[PDB]
Amino acid sequence: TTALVCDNGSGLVKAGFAGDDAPRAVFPSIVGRPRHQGVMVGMGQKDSYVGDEAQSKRGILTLKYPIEHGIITNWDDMEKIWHHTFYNELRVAPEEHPTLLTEAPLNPKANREKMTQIMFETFNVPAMYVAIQAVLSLYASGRTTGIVLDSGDGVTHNVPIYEGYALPHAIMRLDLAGRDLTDYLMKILTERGYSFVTTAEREIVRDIKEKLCYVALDFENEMATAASSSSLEKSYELPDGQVITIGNERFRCPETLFQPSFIGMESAGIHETTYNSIMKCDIDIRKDLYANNVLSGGTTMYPGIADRMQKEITALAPSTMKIKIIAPPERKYSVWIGGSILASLSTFQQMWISKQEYDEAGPSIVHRKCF
Amino acid sequence: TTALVCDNGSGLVKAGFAGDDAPRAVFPSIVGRPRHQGVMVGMGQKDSYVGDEAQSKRGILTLKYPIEHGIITNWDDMEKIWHHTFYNELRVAPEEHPTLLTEAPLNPKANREKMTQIMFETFNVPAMYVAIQAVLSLYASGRTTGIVLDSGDGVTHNVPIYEGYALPHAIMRLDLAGRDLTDYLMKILTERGYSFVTTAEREIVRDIKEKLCYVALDFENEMATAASSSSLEKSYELPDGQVITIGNERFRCPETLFQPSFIGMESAGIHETTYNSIMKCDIDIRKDLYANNVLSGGTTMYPGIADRMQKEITALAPSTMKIKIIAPPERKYSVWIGGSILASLSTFQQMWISKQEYDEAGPSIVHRKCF
Amino acid sequence: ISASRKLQLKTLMLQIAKQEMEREAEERRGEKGRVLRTRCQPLELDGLGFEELQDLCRQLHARVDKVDEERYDVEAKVTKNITEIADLTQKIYDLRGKFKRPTLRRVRISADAMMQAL
Amino acid sequence: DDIYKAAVEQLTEEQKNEFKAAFDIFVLGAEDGCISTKELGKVMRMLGQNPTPEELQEMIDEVDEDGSGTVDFDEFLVMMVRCMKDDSKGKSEEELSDLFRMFDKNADGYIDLDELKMMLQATGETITEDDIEELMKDGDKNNDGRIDYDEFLEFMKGVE
Amino acid sequence: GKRQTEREKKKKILAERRKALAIDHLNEDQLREKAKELWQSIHNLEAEKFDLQEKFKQQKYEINVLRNRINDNQ
Ligand SMILES: Nc1ncnc2c1ncn2[C@@H]1O[C@H](COP(=O)(O)OP(=O)(O)O)[C@@H](O)[C@H]1O
Ligand SMILES: Nc1ncnc2c1ncn2[C@@H]1O[C@H](COP(=O)(O)OP(=O)(O)O)[C@@H](O)[C@H]1O
Ligand SMILES: [Mg+2]
Ligand SMILES: [Mg+2]
């Protein structure tokens, strides 16, 4: 039979059968209970709208993501999300399909063990396998080397790989991602008068960020230009009218990636953690990693980031090496495409964690040889 | 058995069995004791004529409404009105019929508790339920969202509802209604020479208001036109002859709705309390409320109000949203039609306040789960 | 186009549909019996010694546990699927028939000829 | 063809009250019961009955084609009784959906015309002007290339 | 993951809450009767299992119907 390539993610759940080009169903991972009282009788009001249904009734819900930073903080809601994904968005019972979840690097063990225990006890799948979210993104590019920066919505991690041999001592995981950029944008919009507070209006700020923000090639020059002319002010229409005008908030929101001091984080930007991740590698594979830097994940879709990052790394790196940044147009679904490719391989067909194996060793089987 | 859908109202009591199209008996709610001495013996003169009987002998009575502004100020008279409604206008003993009263929003608790205590002790009904007068008017329109402006004769209230979930923090109740318009019309008629003082002549002024007054599309232009031409002066024949001619009093009486400063009230008109009630709602359901504005209640029957209100709201609202005002021809009985529909539902059949429940918790049961 | 055969055609279609429903019920029952026989083998109770009964009932009890697991699984499945079907049916009705539930009325009946009585 | 015909052959007094009321409205005695379809519809709307002009116009297009303006008692009574809602609510919606899913073998989210033709020929009924394309004409509302159970209701709702 | 109640119920039904029955401890006639009871219970319950599979069929039919209706209407 065919395998189910699910990809929990944090912000958008992407799923679909193995062997295709794009995920079949992509929908936000939010579960929102209603918060008001409700007076109409017999309206058929449910107790929790999940997935894309709660992005249409969000006016009277309190949306809450069940995955904070890669890790899962609310297991009941995550179980509800998985149940919805299997039964309503794909309509395939899990009793007859292997599953291939994905997990960020350096995550707590208990999260992974609970994930496998749920998949084997509640949904009762035949066999499931957990894979690191960066190796798949390297599969999708058709490479076999390269250092991949997978800046998702929950957590940004940077896994270097050479000739198929991952370097476990050079993984640099940073917890700045799309959600923190949304919060920072929502916080700097208040400097013009627009106040978004409700958890429903966070979605509106996310839409503003997606449609308007861009990464500046040079930050100081843009700050000077936006403060003199008015060629940058782009307007946007809220879900009820009252258009708003975003000035130099456009390139200040995604600039947080390269200067995490804006949101008070100490660490260095995504332009310098890649160079540090390279320098921890051996001295003889640094040229190949320099030449095959891969971008993935949703948050790396800002217009103009593949040039800013290249300029920064070229500034840091030695002058002789060639710096090349692979930015495929299908960046958002790169991890899932790689997952489909991996699940479609014949050599991989014996790596699944078969159910009888789980019955013999318990949920701690995932840390064992079947990784 | 069938349920009795009574609707106390303030000015007209509307009642009838559940499941029909129109109330069976509609009659003014006035109780008038005779005031003169009376010399004929054996004429069979009663001590209080209630309902529609006191609108024919009103020449020698002192009519007094038992409901001032939604609240009930004279419980003995209200009990008399209910007794008349049950026994003479419907001729069904209440011992064998559930009842569904209606109550304005934000009313004193003691009023509701006394109402249920009367219905359970004096009339001894099997089960009664109290419902908010705006949710029913939303039932009758066949919608499930929308913000309903129910401008009755006692009190005007504006309850917004979305997807069946009422928003309790956005109810704007204003105490200007048909009765204050009658008093203001009676007060401005004195500018031509016609003086109505007696409580019986208030009924004549009410008839004048119903038959002649209309809401102007633009107030200043109408004031200028009525002051130059004479195309507006419509005449009306009193109950004894001596026709009267109403000039620009025609559109000045109902204009008080949009400018409550005429009768000295501070608050804003019904055109601006609706917009304020909308703006208190969440940012994502404002479009639906804009598109589904519902009118109900008797006082919204003035010829030309559904255009004036739409013009005013379109002036206030953002230019992109579409403003639509639902004004069904059966506006007056909209609340009662909705009450019939609600009482005819199967899902609602277990929400009644059964008598044994009242015996166990006292009259304060109404504030509890059985709302 | 005559309204004459509308009644005959709809009655004939109702008869055909009823025959189809009863036939489907009968064939479902027969298939269920066959699947039951091939799953739970028919009970043999002849010439059996007590030890043979002990062993057979032990096998039956192990099978009882196994099939109880199977059936509580399919019972949770059917419960969840029924709930989901009801929810989606009500959602579909809301999208389509919510505007029509109020329209269910018994109106314009008495007041039509109850105006001159006053 | 036969349902209202049977009902008239067993003429009930409840309907007979209105029938004879409209008769004395029409026939004043020793008449042939002409009662033209135009006049019949006029009176049907007049005497407080169902004011549906559609059935009246159907009769007018259908009756008094003789050129004498007279309307025989048989068809006049048939159209009077069928003007009123004579149906047992057309069975049950869920039950009829099961009937149609037994009818519909494709289960492609709808049912195609050919399945309807198969069921119709299984019924074994006579064919007339309301055949062949009348179902096609009525059911092709949005012309979705199919006759769904919802489309089948739109064509001939209230199947009894 | 706060479906501990759900999966704990699953395990309880499959192992504990099932008719966990000591059966091979009975008189010859008694043990035969108990075996007959087990056999009948399996038969009736698997008939119910077939019924649930048929309900899965009907639910899938209605799912397909709803999908087609949604697509045609939107
Ligand atoms: N076109 C875009 N432009 C800018 N940011 C985007 C765009 N699309 C998505 N994002 C950001 O990326 C996030 C989605 O990232 P995604 O790759 O789905 O995370 P995950 O790894 O959990 O799947 C969104 O929250 C959004 O903030
Ligand atoms: N046709 C009409 N035109 C103008 N005003 C009307 C009309 N009918 C009723 N009214 C006003 O509405 C009042 C009746 O309102 P109603 O809806 O009966 O109040 P309640 O909510 O108490 O039932 C009357 O007092 C009258 O002033
Ligand atoms: Mg990701
Ligand atoms: Mg009212």
Swiss-Prot record, chains A, B:
What else is noted? In vertebrates 3 main groups of actin isoforms, alpha, beta and gamma have been identified. The alpha actins are found in muscle tissues and are a major constituent of the contractile apparatus. The beta and gamma actins coexist in most cell types as components of the cytoskeleton and as mediators of internal cell motility.
Primary role: Actins are highly conserved proteins that are involved in various types of cell motility and are ubiquitously expressed in all eukaryotic cells.
Task: Report the SUPFAM superfamilies cross-referenced here.
Answer: Actin-like ATPase domain
Gene field? Actc1
Listed Gene3D superfamilies: 3.30.420.40, Actin, Chain A, domain 4
Q: Which UniProt keywords apply?
A: Acetylation, ATP-binding, Cytoplasm, Cytoskeleton, Hydrolase, Methylation, Muscle protein, Nucleotide-binding, Oxidation
Report the PANTHER family cross-referenced here: ACTIN (PTHR11937)
The identity of this protein, by name, is: Actin, alpha cardiac muscle 1
UniProt cross-references to SMART domains, sorted A to Z: ACTIN
Record note on modification? Oxidation of Met-40 and Met-43 by MICALs (MICAL1, MICAL2 or MICAL3) to form methionine sulfoxide promotes actin filament depolymerization. MICAL1 and MICAL2 produce the (R)-S-oxide form. The (R)-S-oxide form is reverted by MSRB1 and MSRB2, which promotes actin repolymerization.
- Record GO cellular component, one term: filopodium
Q: What class of enzyme is it?
A: hydrolase
- The EC number of this protein is 3.6.4.-
The chain residues annotated with the modification Tele-methylhistidine are: H69
So what family is this one in? Belongs to the actin family.
Q: Which reaction does it catalyse?
A: ATP + H2O = ADP + phosphate + H(+)
Q: Methionine (R)-sulfoxide-modified residues are where?
A: M40, M43
- What is said about its interaction partners and assembly? Polymerization of globular actin (G-actin) leads to a structural filament (F-actin) in the form of a two-stranded helix. Each actin can bind to 4 others.
Please list the residues that carry the modification N6-methyllysine: K80
UniProtKB/Swiss-Prot annotation, chain C:
Annotated segments matching region Involved in binding TNC and actin: 89-110
Reading the lineage from the top rank, the first entry is: Eukaryota
Post-translation changes: Phosphorylation by STK4/MST1 alters its binding affinity to TNNC1 (cardiac Tn-C) and TNNT2 (cardiac Tn-T). Phosphorylated at Ser-2 and Ser-4 by PRKCE; phosphorylation increases myocardium contractile dysfunction.
Residues annotated as carrying Phosphothreonine in the record are T11, T38, T89, T103
Which residues are reported to carry the modification Phosphoserine? S2, S4, S110
The GO terms this record gives for MF are: actin filament binding; calcium channel inhibitor activity; calcium-dependent protein binding; protein domain specific binding; protein kinase binding; troponin C binding; troponin T binding
Q: One Gene Ontology cellular component annotation?
A: cardiac myofibril
Region Involved in binding TNC: what ranges? 1-39
Going by the UniProt record, its keywords in alphabetical order are: Acetylation, Actin-binding, Muscle protein, Phosphoprotein
Supply one GO BP term: vasculogenesis
Please indicate which residues carry the site annotation Involved in TNI-TNT interactions: C40, C57
Biological function: Troponin I is the inhibitory subunit of troponin, the thin filament regulatory complex which confers calcium-sensitivity to striated muscle actomyosin ATPase activity.
Cite the record's note on assembly: Interacts with TRIM63. Binds to actin and tropomyosin. Interacts with STK4/MST1.
What the record says about family reads: Belongs to the troponin I family.
| Protein name per Swiss-Prot or TrEMBL | Troponin I, cardiac muscle
Gene symbol of the encoding locus: Tnni3
From Swiss-Prot, chain D:
Q: Name one GO biological process term.
A: transition between fast and slow fiber
In terms of SMART domains, this protein maps to: EFh (SM00054)
Q: Which residues form the EF-hand domain?
A: 15-50, 51-86, 91-126, 127-160
Query: Which keywords annotate this record?
Result: Acetylation, Calcium, Metal-binding, Muscle protein, Phosphoprotein, Repeat
UniProt cross-references to Gene3D superfamilies, sorted A to Z: EF-hand (1.10.238.10)
Instruction: Provide the positions where the record notes the PTM Phosphoserine.
Output: S97
Residues noted as binding Ca(2+) 1 in the record, renumbered to the chain: D64, D66, S68, T70, E75
Q: Which InterPro entries match?
A: CALM/Myosin/TropC-like (IPR050230), EF-hand-dom_pair (IPR011992), EF_Hand_1_Ca_BS (IPR018247), EF_hand_dom (IPR002048)
Keyword Ligase listed? The answer is no
The miscellaneous remark of the record is: Cardiac muscle Tn-C can bind 3 calcium ions per molecule. Domain I does not bind calcium.
Tell me its family.
Belongs to the troponin C family.
PANTHER family the record matches: MYOSIN LIGHT CHAIN 1, 3, TROPONIN C1, SLOW SKELETAL AND CARDIAC TYPE
How is this protein named in the record? Troponin C, slow skeletal and cardiac muscles
Curated annotation (Swiss-Prot), chain E:
Q: Name one GO cellular component term.
A: troponin complex
UniProt-listed GO biological process terms: atrial cardiac muscle tissue morphogenesis; cardiac muscle contraction; heart development; muscle contraction; muscle filament sliding; negative regulation of ATP-dependent activity; positive regulation of ATP-dependent activity; regulation of heart contraction
The organism sits in which domain of life? Answer: Eukaryota
Q: How is it modified after translation?
A: Phosphorylation at Thr-5 by PRKCA induces significant reduction in myofilament calcium sensitivity and actomyosin ATPase activity.
Q: Which residues of the full protein are shown?
A: 212 to 285 of 301
Q: Name one GO molecular function term.
A: actin binding
Per UniProt, which keywords does this protein have?
A: Acetylation, Muscle protein, Phosphoprotein
Instruction: Describe the family membership recorded for this protein in Swiss-Prot or TrEMBL.
Output: Belongs to the troponin T family.
The function of this protein is: Troponin T is the tropomyosin-binding subunit of troponin, the thin filament regulatory complex which confers calcium-sensitivity to striated muscle actomyosin ATPase activity.
**Basic and acidic residues bias (residue ranges):** 1-13
- Annotated organism of origin: Mus musculus (Mouse)
Phosphothreonine is found on T5
In Swiss-Prot or TrEMBL terms, this protein is called Troponin T, cardiac muscle
